[PDB]
């Protein structure tokens, strides 16, 4: 629906706070942290995949934080 495409980096800014006033950013971060906290097994699976593919340390950290962020 209009649950997503949440008009973020479109441009059009100004000096003043726009709609949610730095609450949507913390909303996004807290809900993905909450979803990680509820489902630890997928986090462990993502960590194992990060250790298997890549194998240079920076690539591992990158794809691990990405597979934590791939949730809809």
């Amino acid at each position: 629906s209009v649950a997503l495409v949440p008009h973020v980096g479109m441009g059009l800014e100004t000096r003043t706070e726009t709609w949610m006033s730095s609450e949507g950013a913390w909303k996004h971060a807290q809900r993905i942290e909450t979803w990680i906290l509820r489902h630890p097994g997928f986090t462990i699976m993502a960590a194992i995949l990060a250790y298997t593919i890549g194998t240079t340390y920076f690539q591992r950290v990158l794809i691990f934080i990405l597979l934590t962020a791939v949730t809809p």
Binding site: S1, P6, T14, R15, T16, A25
Partner: protein, 495 residues
Amino acid sequence: MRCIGISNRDFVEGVSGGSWVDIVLEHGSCVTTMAKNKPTLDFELIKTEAKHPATLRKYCVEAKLTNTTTASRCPTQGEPSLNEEQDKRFVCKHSMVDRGWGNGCGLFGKGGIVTCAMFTCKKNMEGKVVQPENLEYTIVITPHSGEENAVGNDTGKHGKEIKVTPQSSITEAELTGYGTVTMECSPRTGLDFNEMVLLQMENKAWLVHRQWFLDLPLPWLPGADTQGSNWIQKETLVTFKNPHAKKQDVVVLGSQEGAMHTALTGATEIQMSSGNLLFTGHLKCRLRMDKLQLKGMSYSMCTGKFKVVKEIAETQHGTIVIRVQYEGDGSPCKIPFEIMDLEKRHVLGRLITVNPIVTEKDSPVNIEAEPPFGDSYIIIGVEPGQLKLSWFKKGSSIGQMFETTMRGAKRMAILGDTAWDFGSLGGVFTSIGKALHQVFGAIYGAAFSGVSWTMKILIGVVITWIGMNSRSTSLSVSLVLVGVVTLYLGVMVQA
């Protein structure tokens, strides 16, 4: 005045080039200008009014269903039809269920089925557009130099309320005496309309750009409805339940007003009740100032015996105000204001009231000025040295320069290449910087945009790491330039 304590205020020095100074001003802040003569003016922006909009689109937010017809033919002979599928006002869907001799038909198959429902609409989004005419900016330009009632109070008639439209021009404004000021606005380089959509819900409105608003779900309808209700969508709204085998059914999806608001986060809001009352956005004046006396030179240094009636009153890095009350037989004269150092006189400050003046009699005139970063003796009397005041601006020189650098970084942020136009009289360097940052921000335009806070800072740290990996001194135009612009842009956006 009308500009004190409204901090993030835009000091402007220099008038050279004859008289033209380039000012970029917006609804949030205001601009205070200075010159070696031609006394200090204050440019506060107030409401924008786009007069004649035109309605382009209706989205339904809540809907209801009625008359609920359904039909199924037979197992694989016939795909079902229904006579009330003829109106597009009805929503319709084919599916396949099952049929047998229990259902009555025969041949025991997975036969098709239709369902239909009449679509009635509740309160809507009334999205409108405006051309880059039929819109006016109202600017109050107000001068300094006295007149108590309040260095604030933007309500009140001291500064003139001059309108400007793109159907207009050099913007001649008159003040009391001296203030013939000409303003040449360029409103077409402002918000860049024909990319805007004003969006009205039940009470509120928002300013969202056009491609997003066209691209949004929640059924389409064009502006020529009236006797239409021809919503060419509804796969995004009303959903059809189908259980395991048998009869399917219709379901209103409910009001999406909350989901709508969650969609239009990150967009500026706007009150729109009386035609339009458009707010936050910027514009770009060029300012010509010939036509200006100093409200009389034409006077004397005054007699003496002044009196303070107000405090020390420091505002916002240096701007300190003092309200004095002249006592005596003035026949209105000037005010011998100075900002001195200690003994063996080394007078070093600046006065931003230039040529302050007493009015007719007892009336508490007020004066703003900027001391240096430390000790200072602000003096106003003359013949029995009448009155000194001690003041200590805490400050720094280096901290002031660093805060000015942060202001310049915020101008490299939100306001675009207009902030390269925010200075004046630059000739070669300012113009070539504006053109270079024009093409540079065009390459970092759409062109890597559309990304949120988190993903911008993450793409910043990954690109600054791949710049840190240091191949063949591409690491500069990589790593340091890109890391600075990405981090100092990402932590400042989404305001």
